[PDB]
Every structure is written in C-alpha cells, then in structure tokens.
C-alpha cells in the first residue's frame, strides 16, 4: 500500500493516492465494477428466492425483477409471470461474471503493474494527454452505443419488450417501425420539464423509446469514433481544467443529473416502468381512486355528470383550465395522467360522458381498484397507507423506493460535482493547500473591496 | 489566605484531594454532580427498560412491554397527584418501591435529580474555569439550557394542573408534547418561540459558516494535501487569513466580521439569547398567556364569511388537534366525545 | 490592455475591486434575484386573493387585503394549475394571473435560479481570491432545503399548491400539514436535522465561549476587550492551549480537537451534514416515504391494542388530517 508521509493523503483519503498510479487505479475501478455486478446477481437471486408469482411484483418489494420483466423474459398478457427461470439465469450470470471481475480487480490492484505507462503504452494515460483521454472516452462511448443497440435488437428481433399500452391489459410486443423521425425524437429533449410536458419523462410509446435508443446508440458510436480520432479544439483547451479530478467532477455532475432524471422517471413514467410490475404511480393511484368512486356512485343510480360537490365545482367531473373534462376533487392536479386503463374512456375533449356511462369494462374497474388500494404511500418500516394508519399492511411501492433512493444519490453526487470540481480548479491554480502567507492576493488589492 | 495561610485544615485536605487533575475531574461540584447525574441517567434507563405507564397514562412505555428506543419513555405521573413531589416515602407511595414505580414517581425522581445535576454541572464549569484562570463564559452560555430545562420541565408543569402535562422523558413523548403545544397553545405563533427559532437557526448558520470560512482561508503552512497536519498547538500565528475572509464575505454578502473577539462573542451570544427568549415564552404559556389569536382577523372573519388567511387555517388545524387528541391524551377528563361532535372536513 | 470592449466588460465583471463581487454567476444572480425581490415585495404588499386549493375559495395574503406581517404571505399557485408552467404571458390577463397564484411560481423560479447562482458566485469569489473553494459546499445545505420545500415537494406531490407559502403563517401551515400527512417528527432525517441544529447551537456557544475566555489580555478595564484585537494583528490573540485544557478537563481528558483545523472542520461538517440529511428526508417524504409508523405495534396476550406515545402522536395527526383542507377532498383517501 502507501502511507501519509510518502503521499500527503491521510487514510480517509487513501484512494486519492491512486490518482497517478494507473495500474492500481484500473484495479480499483475493476473491483468496484465487480461489486456492482455482484450486487446485481446476488440481489436478483435473493428476489427470485423470495418471490411468489401469485402476488404482483410490486406487492413483494422487488426492484430488479420488474426491470427484467419489462424486457420480456417470462411474462404473459396482463403482466402475468409464466417462467421465473429467466430471472434465475440472469442472477446466476451476473453473479459469475462478478466473480470474474472481482478476481481481475484483485489482480490489477495487488500484483499487476502499479503504473502501466512503461510496460503497456496502450493503457498509459497521463491525465493531461488530451488525445489519450479522448481515446479512452471514445472506446467507452463505443461500448455504450453498442449497449443501446443491444436494447434495440432485443426489442426488434428478440421477442420484443412488454408494451403496457397494448390492447387489453398489455403484453409483450415486438416493436416494428420504431420512431426514427428527428423532429419527434429530439422534440423531447427541448420539451419543457413542467406539468403537461415533462421533458423526456413524458415518453409514452414504445416506438418512441426504441427510436430514441436507436438515435442514441448511433450517435454514441459516431461520437466515440470522433473523440478517438480527434484532439480537443483550442477553445476547448482553455475552457476546461485538464486533470483527473476535473474529469471526475464532470462525470459527477453528469450522473447527478442522470440520477435526478431517473428518480422522476420512476415516479412519473409508466411506459418504461409498467404499472403491472412497479405498481401505480401517484397520479395513477389518485385517478384510480376517483374513477372507482365515480363508477360506484354511478352504479348506485345518480348522475356523476351533473353531481355538484360541496365547493360547487363538480364532485366527479369538472373542466381542466384548458377546457378538457377531468376527474374532480384534488385529483384535478393529476389531470394530465395517461394510463392504459383510462385512455379508452377519453374522447377528443377529454373524458367522455357517454363512454363513462356504459363503455367501462370490468378489467378496468378491477385494475383501478387494485391501484387505489396500493397507492405509493408507505412508512420507513414498510407500513402501507397514509401516515395515520393502523400498522396492518406491509407495503411500500417500489416506485417510492426507487425515487427516494436515487434522488438522495443524485443530490449527493451534485455535492460531489461541487467538491471535486472546486478542488480541481484550486489544485490547477495552486490554492489547494492554502494561502501563500508570503504573497496573499488580497494584500495586493485596493481597500474597501 | 491573603495575609497568611494560617494552618492547614481538613477542608484543605479535602480541597487538595478533590482538585487533583485525574482522568475524571470531580472537584467540589462533583459531590453534587456525579451522584445526581448518575441517578438521573440510570433512572431514565431503568424506566425506559422496565417501568411502565399503564397506571399513569394508560400507555405501555418500556422495553419489557414491547416498546423500542423511540417510543419508550419515563412518563409523568397521573394528573390526580397534582404537583406532588412523589417521594418514595411520601403519602402517595408510602414506601412501596414497586408501587412508587407504578404511580410514576420515577419521573419526579429523574426530573429533580436532573435539575440538581444541571446545577452541579454549571458549578463544575465555574470550578474548572477558576482552576485554569479563564473567564467563565461557558458557564454563562450553559445558563441557557438550564433556563430552558427550568421553564419547560419545572415552571410549565407547575403553572398547569400537575406534572401530568410536563414533557415525559422520551422521544415520542417529547413529540407528543410538541404537538400538544401546537394544538393548545398555538406555540408557533408566539413571538418568543419565533425569537428562539431565529436564535437556534442563526447559531447553526454561524457554526457552519465559521467552520467553512476557517477551513477555506487556511494558510498553507505545509506541503501535504492533508491540511490538518500543518498545524502546531503551540504556534502563535493564526492558522487562517482574517483579511482574506473579511474581503470575501464583504464582497459576497455585503458585511463581514473584522474582529475575532467580536465574531466569537457573537457565536456565543446568538443561541443563548434565542433560548432565553424561548424560555420567557414558555413561562407565558405556563400561565396560559398564549399568543393564540389576532382578534382583528377573527372578528373580520366572523363578519365576513369569505375572508381567509393562513392564520385562520392554522386555527382550524389547532381545533382539530385539540378535539381529536383530548380524549386519549388526558384520560382524567373522561371525555367520551361522540364522533359527531369532533370537527372534521369533507370526505376525510 | 486589450482595446476590445468585450475584454473590458469581462475585466469589469470579474473585477475584485467592486464593492459587491459581480461574477459570471453574478450576471444570472442579479437579474433573477432582483425580479424575485420586486415581485415578492409588490405581491406581499398589495396582491388580490389567490385560489390556492383550486376550489374557488381565494386566500388573502397581502397587507392591503387585511393582513399583518405574521399572517401575510405570497399564496402558492392554484391547485388547478398543478405542476403546469404558468408565466404571465400564459394568463389571459393580469387579473387571472394574480387570481391563480402566478406570482408565487414566478418568485420561486427566479429565486431558485438566484440561489444556485449565489452558490456559484461564492465559489467564483473564492477562486478569484485564491482560497479553498468549499464554502459553496457548506452553502449547498440551505440550498438543498430550500429546493426541497419549494421545488422537490411540489414535484413529488404533483402541484405547486403544496409548496411552502412565502410567509410566516404559511410556513407554519406547511409544517403542520406535513406532519399530518407524513409524520415527519418520527422520521429519522428530521431527527438528524434537529440534532444538527441543536448541535450547531451547542457547538457555536461552546466554541464562542471557549475562544472568548481564552482571549489573552491585550486590553485592560475601562473599555471593551474588542479593542485588543486588530484587523491586521496576524496573530492568535487567544491562548488555545488553555482552552483545550479546559475543554478536556470539563468532560474527560484526551477529548481531541487540539487542532484548530480539526475543530473548525467539525464545526463546518456537523450542521451541514445534518441539514443535508433533513433536506433529503423532506424530499423522500415528498415521494411519500414517511417516518416510522409504530401505531398499534404493542398488543397484549389476548390481542388488545396497548397504546403508546406513538398512538397519541397518531391521534394528533388524525386531528390535523381531518381539518387541513376542509373542502378540497371529495374522497376518503388523500393520496395527493
């Protein structure tokens, strides 16, 4: 290992001693990758061992199995689990690959060359050789593009993926004719992030998702080649700090943004996160409650269209600020929700009064009731319901877990952008250790600020 | 002493022994602090472990009953005992230690021993400061927690009908006390808890800002990337640039400290003043002199059925809290309120 | 230097000779913050009532409409808007924009931009003055909390109507409804936040008292001791060794913190970390995770429920819940 006397970094910053040790840095990164794959495999095995296909996935607190099921792999129409074996196969494969990666990390961390510059020039970066850093970026960018095209191939020629918008309760569909139109695909990124627009979180079709991943894979491969064969422009040299900690800070900012995006994706989106596996969203549960009570009071005579609430605004139906007919009550805040079980009841001007009277099918009612009883509300100790409950139900929605956890991770990695980026700037300038004490900048400035 | 030391007395031997610099300084204040504080903490632990509140609050509040660290609590005695001191030999327990535990006498035991422990701890601060010849500003600062403890655990229950309305020593019990204050006294609207909140938040702000500013204006004083090693306890030069910090905060915020003594006095001053103002407010609540309402707005709302502010909504929330918590929070009242008299919104 | 106007402009913007430091983060902080200040002042003074709950029941929050400073507030945006973007040009008229709570959204957006650029500006001045750039990291904790209570919680709950009102009584209402719907007091992250503010107060008082006591005699009586210190003293005016000895003897020897640097890092890290934790708690509860729910967790041999202090807390929560929005609920479960 190392010591503080020869490095200047204490034990609580010991990995910082690896900044200029290329081989051991590679070993550490490979070991952490092996850790990631090991958690993937072990947690997948844990979930399948604790899984009963009779109950819905979101009832049993599973996060990885919904991810595998969204890709097909043993789900029938309506999100019914047919074979749990593919989940087991995925767990075993990720686990064994993790064993291999862990051995590799151990080797490259203990016995492998400490610095790769001399013996292995192909792997000998210098943290300031801009061409070499761009080459590494290009290699890993090509790998990412290949992964995106792998997803596209899975959806195209390998059984498709689980479309929750398919007629009926949703089913595994083979996506043909992906949305490869530039305007449609790039209109999401420039779309507003507010209500009704939702930025890229509001992607609703599988065709749009597959076309977008097509564009991203192609662009990532092309950009990998470009960043391989080119050196940053002279204006790029002046704009950025060129050090390992600087690159780390840039990546930290990027992945903090991605973590926030994933949190919002899990909370709001129900296309890439079908409610059959992840359970209803917040808006979905609220709309489901309103719909269930509407159909209950409509079955008991009454006329929900003319039913006036206590505020004089409409007990079951009202008009969105734009004019679209929407469910009344507080759920008017979620009027822009769209779900597989409510779209058939929507006409050109929103919810249709005629369809809401006779076109409702029993499966829609059952799904709405189930979503209402499993709203994404829970406690820290996994007690379902609002904060004022009887501590009888054991349920917290997987969407809530994903949203909370990855939001915390996104915030902490933004703090990482701040910390590691400021330190990169200071170290490049030379202030990393403190004021000069012989030539303070402030003492060279005119008084009174 | 002054003119001459006369002869050594047994007090001199006791002082010399007690004032030795051993691992745990006892001192003269120790004879009051160590037994009282030890018994207070041990009583809290025994109560949270074995003692129950089934006969005092009709609540299970011990580990042996199935409560965890959050919900266990040394509950205050029954309201029918009033402000009885609940001595284990008193006319209530009459010597029965088990029944003294059952009656809730452990709460009075812990509260009184804790009060005398706080007195002993401030005495300890005075004694230690006098031994090392320092101005005892930390004892003056510690006067604020003593004021808070006295006003909340002693003055407030004495202003009410009994110890029953004191804070029970526990986590969830303290939370109940807080929500009770919001519901009944409207404690948030009271300007003295406002000043206390401002003091505590400003003290936290000052702590964070001073720490960050010192750690970010350090002089180099070393060649290692670990800036903690580049410091000697006996060095005379300041380890951080006061000029740089002053300039930075002057250009960022507009105003900035230029005097270290004033800065640290301000850091001492803000939380103490906040806590003392909160203590005065709690005394006022002890007398039920609560800043509950703005009469002008209540009158306007009564005359105008469409005038609404966040204050009126808070009043409605307080009303709900009181109505729905009275029945089980105050069992001595025997409030068998039918569900039709409890205030309630629509469809909730 | 360069005769170009752009170079002169960049020199002036980044100049450290300005009384207040403008920066590149400054050129976004100044306009957004000024816009937010203007709108907030004009709305707090004279703004018509706002239909916060979307039930056509406007709430008055301005001084001109019979409010004082304590009750006055800038009412959050209408629940009918939800998370929709509501700029001035979107509304048909200024009257409608005022009615639906547009000023709150305007102030919140321009203010969030302002505080982010304020943190960036703190970093920028640290870089320009040649100091370590981690005051912004400490300042991130208030920014995190403000984002949680103004942006993240509305996003999780699906409406800006659930954002904290820009006022005092509005703040208290937000706190009470939050406790009703999430049991924040039992959440371990508000526990860590409370420990953080109490520790901040404790450590501030402790450190200030120790430094003031250790202040070496450079000024005699008949005047304030502050005259002993000089802004250019460039020396420690307090005996650190005596203060460390006092603190060690007070509780137990070898209590560490003989380093001034270690002491100040601890002072920086305790409240900042705890405020980070409590802001994360607010955001997680915004995604409906709530605190511990030990209601009816203790039962006797036959099955009777034995109440605990958690049950009394639940009774208070029920009291808050059934009254927080009297007319906005048409169905038994809030879920929103």
């Amino acid at each position: 290992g190392r010591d503080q006397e020869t490095t200047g970094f204490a034990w609580w910053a010991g990995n910082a001693r690896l900044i200029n040790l290329s081989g051991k840095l590679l070993g550490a990164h490979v070991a952490h990758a092996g850790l990631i794959v090991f958690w993937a495999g072990a947690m997948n095995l844990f979930e399948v061992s604790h899984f009963v296909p009779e109950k819905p996935m979101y009832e049993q607190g599973l996060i990885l199995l919904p991810h595998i099921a969204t890709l097909g792999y043993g789900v029938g129409p309506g999100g019914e689990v047919l074979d749990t074996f593919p989940y087991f196969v995925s767990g075993v494969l990720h686990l064994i690959s993790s064993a291999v990666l862990g051995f590799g990390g151990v080797y490259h961390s203990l016995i492998g060359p400490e610095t790769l510059e001399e013996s292995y020039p192909f792997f000998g970066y210098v943290w300031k050789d801009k061409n070499k850093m761009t080459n590494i970026l290009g290699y890993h960018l090509i790998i990412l593009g290949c992964g995106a095209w792998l997803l596209v191939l899975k959806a195209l020629y390998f059984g498709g993926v689980y479309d929750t918008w398919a007629p009926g309760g949703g089913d595994v569909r083979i996506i043909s004719n992906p949305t490869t139109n530039a305007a449609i695909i790039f209109g999401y990124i420039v779309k507003s992030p507010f209500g009704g627009d939702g930025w890229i979180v509001s992607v609703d079709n599988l065709e749009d998702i597959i076309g977008g991943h097509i564009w991203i894979g192609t662009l990532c491969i092309l950009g990998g080649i470009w960043h391989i064969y080119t050196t940053p422009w002279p204006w790029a040299r002046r704009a950025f700090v060129w050090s390992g900690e600087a690159y780390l800070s840039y990546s930290l900012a990027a992945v903090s943004l991605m973590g926030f995006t994933a949190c919002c994706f899990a909370w709001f989106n129900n296309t890439a996160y079908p409610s059959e596996f992840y359970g209803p969203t917040g808006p979905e549960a609220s709309q489901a409650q309103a719909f269930t009570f509407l159909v209950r009071d409509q079955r008991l005579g009454a006329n929900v269209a003319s039913a006036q609430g206590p505020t004089g605004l409409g007990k079951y139906l009202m008009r969105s600020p734009t004019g679209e007919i929407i469910f009344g009550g507080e759920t008017m805040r979620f009027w822009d929700f769209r779900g597989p079980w409510v779209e058939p009841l929507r006409g050109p001007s929103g919810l249709d009064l005629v369809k809401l009277k006779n076109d409702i099918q029993p499966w829609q009612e059952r799904r709405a009731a189930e979503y209402m009883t499993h709203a994404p509300l829970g406690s820290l100790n996994s007690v379902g319901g609002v904060a004022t409950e009887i501590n009888a139900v054991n349920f917290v929605s997987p969407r809530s877990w994903l949203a909370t956890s990855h939001f915390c991770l996104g915030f902490f990695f933004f703090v990482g952008h701040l910390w590691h980026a400021g330190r990169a700037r200071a170290a490049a300038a030379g202030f990393e250790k403190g004021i000069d004490r012989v030539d303070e900048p402030v003492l060279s400035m005119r008084p009174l600020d | 002493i002054g003119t001459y030391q006369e002869k050594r007395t047994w007090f001199d031997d006791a002082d010399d022994w007690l004032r030795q610099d051993r691992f745990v300084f006892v001192g003269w204040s120790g004879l009051l602090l160590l037994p009282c504080a030890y018994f207070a903490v041990g009583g809290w632990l025994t109560g949270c472990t074995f003692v129950t509140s089934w006969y005092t609050h009709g609540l299970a509040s011990s580990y042996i009953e199935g409560c965890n660290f959050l919900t266990a609590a040394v509950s205050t005695p029954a309201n029918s005992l009033g402000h009885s001191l609940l001595f284990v030999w008193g006319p209530e327990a009459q010597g029965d230690l088990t029944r003294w535990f059952q009656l809730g006498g452990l709460w009075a035991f812990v509260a009184l021993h804790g009060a005398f422990g706080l007195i002993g701890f401030m005495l300890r601060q005075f004694e230690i400061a006098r031994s090392v010849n320092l101005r005892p500003y930390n004892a003056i600062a510690f006067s604020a927690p003593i004021a808070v403890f006295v006003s909340v655990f002693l003055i407030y229950p004495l202003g009410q009908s009994g110890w029953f309305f004191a804070p029970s020593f526990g986590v969830a019990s303290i939370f109940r006390f807080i929500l009770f204050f919001q519901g009944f006294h409207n404690w948030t609207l009271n300007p003295f808890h406002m000043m206390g909140v401002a003091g505590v938040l400003g003290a936290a702000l000052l702590c964070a800002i001073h720490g960050a500013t010192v750690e970010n204006t350090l002089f180099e004083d070393g060649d290692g990337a670990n800036t903690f090693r580049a410091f000697n306890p006996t060095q005379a030069e300041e380890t951080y640039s006061m000029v740089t910090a002053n300039r930075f905060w002057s250009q960022i915020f507009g105003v900035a400290f230029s005097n270290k003594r004033w800065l640290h006095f301000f850091m001492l001053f803000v939380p103490v003043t906040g806590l003392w103002m909160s203590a005065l407010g709690v005394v006022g609540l002890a007398l039920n002199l609560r800043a509950y309402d703005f009469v002008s707005q209540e009158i306007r709302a009564a005359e105008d059925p469409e005038f609404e502010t966040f204050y009126t909504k808070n009043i409605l929330l307080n009303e709900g809290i009181r109505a729905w918590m009275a029945a089980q929070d105050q069992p001595h009242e025997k409030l068998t309120l039918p569900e039709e008299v409890l205030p309630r919104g629509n469809a909730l | 230097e360069n005769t170009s106007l752009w170079a002169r402009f960049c020199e002036w913007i980044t100049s450290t000779e300005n009384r207040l430091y403008i920066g590149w983060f400054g050129v976004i902080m100044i306009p957004t913050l000024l816009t937010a200040i203007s709108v907030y002042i004009i709305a707090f003074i004279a703004a018509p009532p706002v239909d916060i709950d979307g039930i056509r029941e406007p709430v008055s929050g301005s001084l001109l409409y019979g409010n004082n400073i304590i009750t006055g507030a800038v009412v959050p945006t209408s629940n009918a808007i939800g998370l929709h973007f509501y700029p001035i040009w979107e509304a048909a008229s200024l009257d409608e924009w005022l009615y639906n709570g547009g000023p709150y959204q305007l102030v919140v957006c321009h203010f969030f931009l302002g505080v982010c650029c304020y943190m960036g500006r703190e970093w920028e001045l640290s870089y320009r003055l040649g100091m370590r750039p981690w005051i912004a990291v400490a300042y991130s904790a208030p920014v995190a909390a403000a984002t949680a209570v103004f942006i993240i919680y509305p996003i999780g709950q699906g409406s800006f109507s659930d954002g904290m009102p820009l006022g005092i009584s509005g703040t208290f209402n937000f706190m009470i409804v939050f406790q009703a719907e999430h049991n924040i007091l039992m959440h371990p992250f508000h526990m860590f936040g409370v420990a953080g503010v109490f520790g901040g107060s404790l450590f501030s008082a402790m450190h200030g008292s120790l430094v003031t006591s250790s202040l070496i005699r450079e000024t005699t009586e008949n005047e304030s001791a502050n005259a002993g210190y000089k802004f250019g003293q460039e020396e420690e005016t307090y005996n650190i060794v005596a203060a460390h000895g006092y603190f060690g003897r007070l509780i137990f020897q070898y209590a560490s913190f003989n380093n001034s640097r270690s002491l100040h890092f601890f002072l920086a890290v305790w409240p900042v970390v705890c405020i980070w934790l409590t802001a994360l708690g607010i955001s997680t509860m915004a995604f409906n995770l709530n605190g511990f729910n030990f209601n009816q967790s203790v039962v006797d041999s036959n099955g009777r429920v034995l109440n605990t202090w958690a049950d009394i807390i639940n009774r208070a929560n029920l009291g808050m819940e059934v009254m927080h929005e009297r007319n906005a609920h048409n169905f038994p479960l809030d879920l929103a």
Partner: peptide
C-alpha cells in the same frame, strides 16, 4: 392604516440594511 405602518417598518429595515452595507465604517487593518 396598519398596512402603512407595516410598510414603513419594512422600508426602515431595508434602508438600515442598505446603509450598513454601502456606508459601513471601513475595516481598519492594524
């Protein structure tokens, strides 16, 4: 009339802040 008093108090506080920022006594070094 109460609104007038509140506005005056807020304006006074803001003016005091402005004067304390831009008309402060210079920090005298040594």
């Amino acid at each position: 009339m109460e609104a007038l008093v509140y506005t005056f108090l807020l304006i006074g506080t803001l003016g005091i802040i402005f004067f304390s920022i831009f008309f402060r006594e210079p920090p005298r070094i040594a």
